């Protein structure tokens, strides 16, 4: 494997920095999160997450994305959750069965570390996608 | 080499024992006054030396208190992880570094990335003391 | 087969070895946001090793600065140097030319379905612009 430690906090708050400058008055940043660390490939991550953005940016029109992190013995939950328009829950296959609204290169990119991407409605209003994947111990 | 950063080697370990706290909800973790000693190195590598080390500490040892200390000298820092757990009998030792979590092979790759050991030893507090030394920044 | 690049590292590497390869040379990435894109890493290093081959074996250069530049279109990556430059009636026809020869930039911009150009530079010499299409 290319794969080496990869904080993945960390990763989140530099990927909120840097949508930041991409994205003119989005409001998107890291909740307080715990560092965890995983095992993975952080070009690969950061494209996934990189995609959860523009694809809540770009398709659903969100102004506000919160980034968050929560870890346990299994590994870690990383969510992407918007107040843009959401995906009804009856096309949430199809969504991840697309390349970008589409968002197969998350599911790609979680496959590829052995977890899940899935897709729920955020308190925020719009969707939450939810990558979960396996911790390294 | 040069993705090598200052690491204040004594914060990363205060809060490996705070994060560790909220995973493993009967354990006792933390860190031992320790002076603060700043290293050269991947702090996503060293944390995850030591969330594995209170891992195996945790689902292997059956470990229910685990300390982290820092000792400093003109060669660098020795991190160590003290259990009450099971431990390691002496001849598992080399065993478990060359194996994938009882596996600790992650500890030993960290640290022979940054130039230095990972060793296992016998606590004061029943369990396996897992000792890293790692070659300061001069 | 296009893989998870990220250029921002792949450039911070590119000039940390082109650094001990060429006597007196300052060469260093500029402060730039990561960004990922889907591409050939073999082939994008040698773009910019070649880029920067040319501005110092043929350029004079003795100051060379990479930067990336990310917007929703992708990634503007930048080699700027202080050498001689590229004289404005040779600014098409080096990219056809092997080494004064950027063939092997163009080659690869146009695998990544992007484009090379040259302008000016703010430190004298060539700034050499590799347009990449993102990912998303």
């Known amino acids: ?12 708050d530099r990927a909120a920095h840097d949508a930041a ?4 008055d989005l409001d998107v940043s890291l909740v307080p ?4 660390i995983i095992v993975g490939l952080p070009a690969g991550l950061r494209l996934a997450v990189d995609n959860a ?12 994305v919160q980034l968050s992190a929560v870890s346990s013995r299994a590994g870690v939950e990383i969510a ?11 096309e949430r296959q199809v969504v991840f069965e697309r390349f970008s609204l589409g ?3 998350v599911a790609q ?12 409605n955020s308190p925020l209003g719009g969707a939450r996608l939810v990558l979960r994947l396996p911790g390294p111990s």
């Open 1 to 12: 494997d290319d794969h080496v430690p990869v904080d993945i906090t960390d990763l989140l």
């Open 80 to 90: 992407i959750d918007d107040n843009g328009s959401g995906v009804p829950e009856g």
């Open 109 to 120: 990119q979680a496959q590829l570390h052995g977890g899940t991407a899935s897709l729920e």
């Open 53 to 64: 953005i523009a694809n809540a940016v770009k398709h659903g029109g969100a102004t506000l």
């Open 33 to 36: 999160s715990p560092t965890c």
């Open 21 to 24: 400058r991409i994205y003119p």
């Open 103 to 105: 968002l197969a290169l």
